[PDB]
Amino acid sequence: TDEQIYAFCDANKDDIRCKCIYPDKSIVRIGIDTRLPYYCWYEPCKRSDALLPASLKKNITKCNVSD
């Protein structure tokens, strides 16, 4: 469940796998300025061990990234 994943990364913010729930401030600004959300391009969110909610996964599909 997405709620469980969120709770886990709330406790473990600075874990690499939880940087798709809590990205560094520079990344957020870059995403705004490039007009594409951070999760569409950021490297820890293209990892296969990444902790990604189903809701977040849908959002990635809805920014229409081809990778």
Curated annotation (Swiss-Prot):
Topology in membrane: Single-pass membrane protein
Segments on the Virion surface face: 1-67
GO CC list: membrane; viral envelope; virion membrane
Keyword set, alphabetical order: Fusion of virus membrane with host cell membrane, Fusion of virus membrane with host membrane, Membrane, Signal-anchor, Transmembrane, Transmembrane helix, Viral envelope protein, Viral penetration into host cytoplasm, Virion, Virus entry into host cell
Signal sequence bounds: none
Main location (coarse class): virion
Keyword NADP recorded: no
Subcellular localization(s) per the UniProt record: Virion membrane
A GO biological process held by the record: symbiont entry into host cell
Quaternary context: Part of a stable entry-fusion complex (EFC) which is at least composed of proteins A16, A21, A28, G3, G9, H2, J5, and L5. Formation of the viral membrane is necessary for the assembly of the complex.
Family the entry assigns: Belongs to the poxviridae A16/G9/J5 family.
Function in brief: Envelope protein part of the entry-fusion complex responsible for the virus membrane fusion with host cell membrane during virus entry. Also plays a role in cell-cell fusion (syncytium formation).
Protein name: Protein J5
Upper taxonomic lineage: Viruses, Varidnaviria, Bamfordvirae, Nucleocytoviricota, Pokkesviricetes
Full protein: residues contained: 2 to 68 of 133
